[PDB]
């Protein structure tokens, strides 16, 4: 994994932290990387003509489920118990989506 080495120093201005944990699932979705779409040196990207693979489909399903759960949570005047349930479900979905890459990488 490429690392932009720290720029050691003191900063008196505001500093922004952006979470890129969704980087690898996002790459898998966008470029249609799958066991069924990539020929096996780094293999070339699958052509855009190919339909979505199984692994991208699973990652997309998880992301869309988290989006739906978050949208339901955004609804005002909701039961706190159901709010806790949806929060836990959203956390689980995020964890699974972020951990997906380990199946291919390790």
């Amino acid at each position: 994994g490429l690392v932009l080495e720290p720029k050691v120093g003191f900063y008196d201005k505001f500093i922004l932290l952006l979470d890129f944990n969704s980087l690898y699932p996002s790459i898998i979705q966008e470029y249609n990387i799958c066991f069924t779409t990539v020929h096996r040196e780094i293999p070339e990207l699958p052509h855009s003509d190919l339909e979505m693979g199984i692994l991208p489909r699973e990652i997309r399903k998880l992301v869309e489920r988290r989006r739906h759960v978050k949208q339901l949570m955004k609804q005002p005047d909701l039961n706190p118990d159901l709010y806790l349930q949806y929060d836990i479900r959203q956390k689980a979905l995020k964890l699974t989506a972020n951990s997906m890459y380990g199946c291919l990488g390790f």
Binding site: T36, T37, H39, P46, H47, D49, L50, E51, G53
Partner: protein
Amino acid sequence: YDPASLPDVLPLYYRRLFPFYQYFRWLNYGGVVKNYFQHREFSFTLKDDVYVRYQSFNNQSELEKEMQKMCPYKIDIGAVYSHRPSLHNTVKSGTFQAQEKELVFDIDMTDYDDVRRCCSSADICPKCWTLMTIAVRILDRALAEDFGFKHRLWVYSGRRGVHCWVCDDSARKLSQAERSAVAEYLSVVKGGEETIKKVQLPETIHPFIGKSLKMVERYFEKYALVDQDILENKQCWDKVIALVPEVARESLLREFSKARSSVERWDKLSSCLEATRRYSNIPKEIMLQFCYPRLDVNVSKGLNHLLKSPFSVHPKTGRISVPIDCKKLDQFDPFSVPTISLICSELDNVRTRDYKRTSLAPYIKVFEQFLDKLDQSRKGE
């Protein structure tokens, strides 16, 4: 011809008339390339408009069998793929690619509707067929001179127009981009129904355009000035006036009020334009807009395009898609083309020579000569 009689005649034809031997000679291309015939895509249209594709066959026997079994209403030939189409489900995604196909052109009378006066839509008559007669000469000459394609089979489409199959090995390996380049090079009449002036030649006439205008001129007087009578009355010559600058339009109108024949009106228009010099090509632009072929670049650009097979039967006219001899083009008559009903009547009136007893024979002969030329090229090379 009764189209309810189509389901009765189709089997017999596919059993005793469809030239399977020569058909396999064609699509097999002398066996030089292995799996060439085995990777060819076909598509069938059956009764009640049921469409099937990714059909491939092992050899002539399998094709004859499955065809006589299905009795399709339409047969379309497609590309030669990387694998056998029948097993496209088995090929890993992205690994199923169309690799080679003849370069094909479709010229359809319906695309000339805004510029013909005798017929409309799917109607054709002897007065308008000369347009096709022009196209075949204009295009085929280019294909024989500018591009050097040597094996070209022209086929009647059955009703509204003609197809051309350019089958040189070089023409079969052309990429999509090269095909699009070839189509655009041959294409002059650009625009839709919303544009009036569809040809705008530059000051310099490219040699190809000069030779196309030379071919057009030979026929123009008969087609446009005698038969079509594109200057018969005001409702029509208003268009041609609409195709030239307004400056002389008035000057023309009075002249067209004193002319009795459209040949006279053409002479007057040519004289007036000559008198008026950057517009010296305007008559050529009018001739092209009334005579030059229109080409659907989508038909010829894509490798995966399925086009009507030769010796097909037209679902409505019943005519056979017969090859057209280039030399005898001037004698070709789309109304004398054998229909399936006529050739079944002929068949039931008397093994590998049955077709020689029908009116289909000279067209199979032209096809056999074309295949003989292809074989000579495959050998000599």
